[PDB]
Amino acid sequence: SQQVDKIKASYPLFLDQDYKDMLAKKRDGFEEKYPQDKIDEVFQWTTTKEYQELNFQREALTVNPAKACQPLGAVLCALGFEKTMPYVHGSQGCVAYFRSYFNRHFREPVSCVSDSMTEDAAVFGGQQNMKDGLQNCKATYKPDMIAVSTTCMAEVIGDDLNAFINNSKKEGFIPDEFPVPFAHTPSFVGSHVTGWDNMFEGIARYFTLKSMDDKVVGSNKKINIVPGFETYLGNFRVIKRMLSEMGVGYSLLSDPEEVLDTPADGQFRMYAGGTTQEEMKDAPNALNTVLLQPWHLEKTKKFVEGTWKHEVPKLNIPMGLDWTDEFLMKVSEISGQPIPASLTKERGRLVDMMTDSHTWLHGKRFALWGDPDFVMGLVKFLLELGCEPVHILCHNGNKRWKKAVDAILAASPYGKNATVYIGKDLWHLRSLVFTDKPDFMIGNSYGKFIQRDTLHKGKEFEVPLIRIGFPIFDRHHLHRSTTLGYEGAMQILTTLVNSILERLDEETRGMQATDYNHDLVR
Amino acid sequence: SQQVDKIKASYPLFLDQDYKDMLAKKRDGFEEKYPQDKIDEVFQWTTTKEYQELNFQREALTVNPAKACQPLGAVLCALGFEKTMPYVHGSQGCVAYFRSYFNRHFREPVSCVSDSMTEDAAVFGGQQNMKDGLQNCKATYKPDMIAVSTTCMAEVIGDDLNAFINNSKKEGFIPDEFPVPFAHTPSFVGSHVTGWDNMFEGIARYFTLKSMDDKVVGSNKKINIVPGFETYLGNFRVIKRMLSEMGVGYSLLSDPEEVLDTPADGQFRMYAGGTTQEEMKDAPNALNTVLLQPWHLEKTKKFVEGTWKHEVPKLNIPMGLDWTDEFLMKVSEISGQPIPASLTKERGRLVDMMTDSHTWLHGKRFALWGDPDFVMGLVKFLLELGCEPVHILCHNGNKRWKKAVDAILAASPYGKNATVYIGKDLWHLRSLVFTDKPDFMIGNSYGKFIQRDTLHKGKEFEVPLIRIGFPIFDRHHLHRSTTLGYEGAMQILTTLVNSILERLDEETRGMQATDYNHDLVR
Amino acid sequence: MSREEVESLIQEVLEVYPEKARKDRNKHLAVNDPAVTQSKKCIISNKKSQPGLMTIRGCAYAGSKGVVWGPIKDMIHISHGPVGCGQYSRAGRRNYYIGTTGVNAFVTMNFTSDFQEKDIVFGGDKKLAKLIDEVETLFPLNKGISVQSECPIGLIGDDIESVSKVKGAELSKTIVPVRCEGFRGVSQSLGHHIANDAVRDWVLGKRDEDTTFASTPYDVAIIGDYNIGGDAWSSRILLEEMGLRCVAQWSGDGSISEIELTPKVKLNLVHCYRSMNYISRHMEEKYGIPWMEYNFFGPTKTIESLRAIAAKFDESIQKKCEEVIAKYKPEWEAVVAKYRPRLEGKRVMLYIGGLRPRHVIGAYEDLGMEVVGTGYEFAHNDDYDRTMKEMGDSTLLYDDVTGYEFEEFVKRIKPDLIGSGIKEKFIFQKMGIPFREMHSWDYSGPYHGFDGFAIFARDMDMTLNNPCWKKLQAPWE
Amino acid sequence: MSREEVESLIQEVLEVYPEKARKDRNKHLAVNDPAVTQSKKCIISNKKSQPGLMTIRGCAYAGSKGVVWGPIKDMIHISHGPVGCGQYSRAGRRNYYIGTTGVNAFVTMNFTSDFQEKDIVFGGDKKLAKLIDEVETLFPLNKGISVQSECPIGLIGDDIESVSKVKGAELSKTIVPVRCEGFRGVSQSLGHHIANDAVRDWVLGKRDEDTTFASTPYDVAIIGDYNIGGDAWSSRILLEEMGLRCVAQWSGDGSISEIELTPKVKLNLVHCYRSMNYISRHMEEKYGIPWMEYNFFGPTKTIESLRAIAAKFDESIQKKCEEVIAKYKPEWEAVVAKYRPRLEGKRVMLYIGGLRPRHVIGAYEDLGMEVVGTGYEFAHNDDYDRTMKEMGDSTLLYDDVTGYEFEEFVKRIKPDLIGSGIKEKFIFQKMGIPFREMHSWDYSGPYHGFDGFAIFARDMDMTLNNPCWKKLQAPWE
Ligand code: ICS
Ligand code: ICS
Ligand SMILES: [Ca+2]
Ligand SMILES: [Ca+2]
Ligand SMILES: [Mo]
Ligand SMILES: [Mo]
Ligand SMILES: [Mo]
Ligand SMILES: [Mo]
Ligand SMILES: [Mo]
Ligand SMILES: [Mo]
Ligand SMILES: [S]
Ligand SMILES: [S]
Fold this sequence. Notes:
The complex is a heterotetramer, with 2 copies of chain A and 2 copies of chain C.
Chain A: H1 10-13, H2 17-31, H3 36-45, H4 49-55, E1 62-63, H5 70-79, E2 84-89, H6 92-106, E3 113-114, H7 119-124, H8 127-141, E4 145-150, H9 152-156, H10 161-170, H11 192-208, E5 223-226, H12 233-245, E6 250-252, H13 277-282, E7 288-291, H14 298-308, H15 320-335, H16 341-361, E8 365-369, H17 372-384, E9 388-394, H18 399-410, E10 419-422, H19 426-435, E11 440-443, H20 447-457, E12 465-467, H21 485-507
Parallel strand pairs in A: 2-3, 2-4, 5-6, 5-7, 8-9, 8-11, 9-10, 11-12
Helix pairs in contact in A: 4-19, 5-11, 8-10, 11-14, 15-17, 15-21, 16-21, 17-18, 19-20
Chain C: H1 3-14, H2 19-26, E1 29-31, H3 60-69, E2 76-80, H4 84-88, E3 111-112, H5 117-122, H6 125-138, E4 145-149, H7 152-155, H8 160-171, E5 175-178, H9 188-204, E6 219-225, H10 233-241, E7 245-251, H11 256-261, E8 267-270, H12 273-287, E9 291-293, H13 298-310, H14 315-343, E10 347-350, H15 356-359, H16 361-366, E11 370-376, H17 381-388, E12 396-399, H18 403-413, E13 417-420, H19 422-430, E14 435-437, H20 449-464
Parallel strand pairs in C: 2-3, 2-4, 4-5, 6-7, 6-8, 8-9, 10-11, 10-13, 11-12, 13-14
Antiparallel strand pairs in C: 1-12
Helix pairs in contact in C: 1-18, 3-9, 6-8, 9-12, 13-14, 14-20
One molybdenum atom (MO) binds at residues 291-292 of chain D.
PDB class: oxidoreductase
Keywords: Azotobacter vinelandii, MoFe-protein, oxidoreductase
Assembly: tetrameric
């Protein structure tokens, strides 16, 4: 039943007695459900160290991964170029998922096409889909460029992308001079960040590989910036903002801010902003190229060093105090521009916030996960804050990356309880937060089910989730935030200390029980 | 007892059994405490409509006010002027409190002196304190200006500030040219916002009243901006940013952002930034003067209109979509500068966030309090979001302001359930959130004790607090936020919708009970 | 618009296409004529998507794992292949259930074999067998395993059916091999069919020789309700208030035991015809069980369905049917009184999957709204046969609409509200057109039944009449 | 530094002042000689603050309402006058209590008569009478009312004593008038004395002819512990582990009945000498109850106090004292073992109110730290008499230090750590100097007793050694 002036949705509608009674009858009548005592017994077992040992012996089963597949990253990279349509050669189910996954994180339209390879293409290859698809895409959505990646179908059957695209031009499906860069993006290699690297390197090759003879390093007086797989709009913006405050001429290569943040003014804009084709063609004339997330830009780095002849600086992701400092100092060194008083003051304001909040942050224990560069920058900043990374998980990390993070931990007394996990998933992480409980998790929305599990054991075992990363689906507009530079460090610091204080307030809200410590001033 | 490797502070130390037993013995032995059943009985009574009726019949008792006293605002206003020392003629206990109260909100030094009037001044007056205080202050802290306000002792005994200052100068305690503007700021009139108005009008009079003959309205082609009592750094910053973005020449009169946000770089800066003396002397040559918080700037308005002859535009506080629109359109009309494409796009990004989040905001019910301009702007924006302000409380509001908010409410179907309360306090509001429960409170840190009370009745009665206003003492760095302009509206929107979604997650976290609605995507 | 004007709109939109795509898309767009019984004379469907045109369709794995199998709560479903598919589909569909997740129920978890290159080159059958052992150890209360094949499985020649037969025999466990690779078929639809055939072949017959279930003449199954936001629960409550016993729910909040009990029911009540008619026809043929289509969207259709269902039983069920109708009459009449004046005359375009584009029309009409265009991602012509009589004369129909087409149709027709999916939502909000998700219900619902109609009405009003839609143009433009 | 270097520092800092202020401030600054017993020959105190020099002191209302009366948990304390005083002092001080706030306890609430101009013009005695009736109706479980006068009360000539007696007789209720107006005295100190006299005159004698209380030979009262972060509780547990019975706590977590029972105890244990010696002397003279000073900061002082307190009772209490010392010995030794190596040799400057600038020295020394400068806002010369022996030779002493002086002293001495108040904290952090709040305990504590020592040590380490202090210089500077 409903009362028309206080309508109930699913929660709390189904807590009404008649719905409760009906669901008990369904269970008892027809579900042949395990007894609740057995369910409790098994749940408790899944919180034990014995279960963790079996859990960590998995060799074939993955449960709740913390990574996605290559063409997702290819599509995000392609979106950063002016009037460019991401095009995934292969089966259309993939593109529905890529679009929906980004739709839910950015709350924006996400334009991407498929060429809808079916059983016929499974037998004969996908050449006809490529010729018709490129012609249909260009006629209908009028992009200035189509950037081609692949689904795993096209990879397994071995479609020759280069031949297919060349034949599309030779047979007149698209004009010979129409730009169609491509990359193979096999989902069974690496992860979504690998797909970003592969797609960028393909676009860079397309516009520069055969035109290097007239290039001269440093002749356009700019610095190239390659952001990598980046899902916070504030991170594109803070980099542009800082470089512009120093008067540093730059070229951001793959820039999807505008198309991921169009205004609601009565018009749908399929394309907006983005790196221009001329910016890519001219990028070898830069002074140098800075990779913002180097641990998934290895293929791009090889091309920029080997063909453009840029002496790519050895820089970490600019997260936290030290690494933002190093980023600005290196940019100052390459460009000749001094670090202006405005950024020096901004830096001191971050340090001020650190002095203000250090007593609440000291010794707090975190479990965290995400992509390799993001995770290592978060680990570094937590150490600067006097916090203790305890469980550091990077499902798509590698052994060299783990060696680098272990060295960062070893250099700080706040890393003494930290372990770095690569190749492990969020079902592994769930055991860790039961057997070696931290204070908080820092992660994406999939962490909410870990928090739910820990609370089921009891309030004193609950590990609350702090949402930083990708994807974030169950909160609105956090994709607008920043995690890089001084600005991103201030936002992370504010979120962390206020998460601590919100949780303390919850624990001290009980009147005449715990509210002796429910202080007005903290 | 303590375990050296896991040291417990008061919470949870005093939950140890030996502490519990000791406190039980203390209570039963010596406290002659009411029985718990009687305590439960009286608590339940304080949640009833019967109690609320008695509560609202109060004429003499105030409980948990939501306002402070005049000199607090005078100090904040004085802090906005270059190398200016706020000086409060009267009792030193006041200045200790003013400094501490701003210390805890901004987490910054707050410089302010007293002249330490003691009991002898009740008979003999405070002139000697003014003579020595002005000389000591100038010599010791080297301000370029001393801005004088009063404590309630000095008001009751009737100290003649003008004569005291003139005698100090005539007798050589301070140079005759040294700027000493003053204002009477009686704590028993109005509230802290009244003190801001009084102090600003005194400074404005000091630099312009006797020099009007050479002034020409519009001759300096700028617009004056008077912010009023403002405790978010982002609010000073967003007005300056939007005006610069338009190319509008302006003068912010009382600008404390720098001195309330100095960097931690190894040196303490007692003064930083601030409106210059030349800017106040030149202010009558502006095209016009805009008042950001007009409902506590009435004395300033009369001076600017009657003496500077500026036709102060009838503008609401620039909060929410409509009133930010009106502000930019009026600045454009006065200055002749068009609204640039960047601001138009920013506006459309706020509208986009509104369309993205409208389904979770719709119909949500709020109790809220604060200063009059802040409160009406929050009411206005809530209506624009499809939210229902239900309990609107302004302890320091007046009947004309109430009439204006009632007219705003009557113009929107979302105002049909709203009542505006003036002269009522947070013990009044506590009754209202029991007898007519909203979804959330929007208020300052004093609201946490109302949330504590509502949870005590039951989890289904808990009204969570969303911290927006002043003072905020129990979270860190929220004073860096913004509530004005499109930027402020984006921040408030994000906090409101994510507060709704955080609470829904808490309510649906119960496994096999409510987590059927614990959605990954919202 | 006149039928001629709608036809000119179709032709003008088609002008952008190359002639091959143009000739094809013309066959999938039509002006409705409600007198037509054979929709194939007006529109064709269930064909390949033309390449590069930005179809909204998914794949057979979506139809099998995401739609039919995924909701079954006490089995573990393996997304078998590389990591992408199971990650994008993890908890994206609101197929609600009661259980202890990770312990006896597993719906919102993502189990996968996370194929790497070694598995592509050498085959994944050995990995799948090891994976099954690890599932059994770490999730001992699972009541069966399904293997949802992603694209590479068939392409590399893996034999998941023999792994399933061998491991299932070894462990005395039900292990269902599903060959739902995304390259199969042309859409989610073939995934439905593959999934019903897997239920048929591996699960449904398990109790064929078991007579221990005491049936009654009032035993029914709810077929094709995936319990989006609780939809099936607010349907089940009415059927049991009317005196029927709902033995099974396929597959929202569904258990493997109630699937195995379904051949014991007396009547299969089919809500989603598209996805479940296959197994409904199978049970008619094998067990003699009749099936009938019904509609619980809005009061008019719900009341008609309750009476149609009750007429198959006896006078006692018909008496309870009329009592249920009498109980809820003041409730939905109050919903109509509040919200119909707010929605009277407003015009909606729909684009959804295989059932809702026709099946919610009555609920809109109960609030005085008009559905001026509708269409489906993957319906067949028997779906369009059922649609044309439900839509008004000279309304627009679109099968497997392209993004370009849908945007252009919307710009000409200018509806007051669009009901579609997540890939469409943010496009049309930016044009200033109120939008409601008609897959996920925009994280609201249920919408089925009388209790769902209240929520549906509230939702269409809060969005269509929201103050935000009057604010998109800056006052200085 | 040497004695001459400190003397030269003092004279250089004084050079900024006009002659009148210079001559005065010179008397309030000294180089310590631990052999001094007559501190008045080297430092004077409890004098007016020089105008305009940014003293850190508060007022007599803070000393009475904020310090002594406000913590009494089951009474309602009216801030009587305008709205400021009670608002700035609401829940600023962490005088912790157990109760149900708003129902039987009221500590963190702000009750005020919120004077407006008509109250100044006509007087507030009528308003006060009506306020009392409203308090009784709306908070019927209060066990007494105090009236804390703010500046205007005596300046306009109101008669709150008459209101208190008349309304008190009318209502059979204890209503205490306190004349703690901020213009009285020079600081928080006189507020203490006024508050003591108000306790003496209106509360303390109520049970003089009541013999129903069951005494024991081991009854004591904790006098002058305001339970900051639970300080009094972690003191009380030790005294009762030593076989004593703590009848009362003045006034942290204190009840009005405890206070009225205090004339029944055998010994008054005075921790804050400054604020409560007055009532302690009264109770000895009137009731024959002796009193003694003690110190629970750090293990050395706590062990010494427990032994000195036990020596006042029989051998059985002395035996339990050594058992208490034996129990906690491994606990505080683990604290020293962990934290003293992290803090050995570090130098601290302190500036606090009237007790802790000397009481916490032993605790710092228990961690190997050296207190190189200390001073008080409002101590008297009997406080400084007690300080000389506690401080090293040639250390710096400052009474009612000005903001300028404290900054200049810190710049020259360069301490590793500063312990002071909220108005000082953010100045010195910007200079790069670790700072600990030694009033509010920086939202931590307790610091009293053995359990408090562990927290104190952890807190000094976490701040002095925090990685943030090595980051204030940008690397390009
Ligand atoms: S199953 Fe089908 S697309 Fe019948 S695949 Fe799809 S939960 Fe749609 S129109 Mo999403 S044939 Fe169900 C459907 Fe309808 S996932 Fe849901 S809303 S009634
Ligand atoms: S009462 Fe006094 S200023 Fe003895 S007014 Fe002050 S809670 Fe200080 S040095 Mo705040 S004489 Fe207590 C004090 Fe000491 S408020 Fe606390 S810390 S031991
Ligand atoms: Ca959006
Ligand atoms: Ca600060
Ligand atoms: Mo057609
Ligand atoms: Mo089978
Ligand atoms: Mo049928
Ligand atoms: Mo001295
Ligand atoms: Mo008295
Ligand atoms: Mo004594
Ligand atoms: S989950
Ligand atoms: S409170």
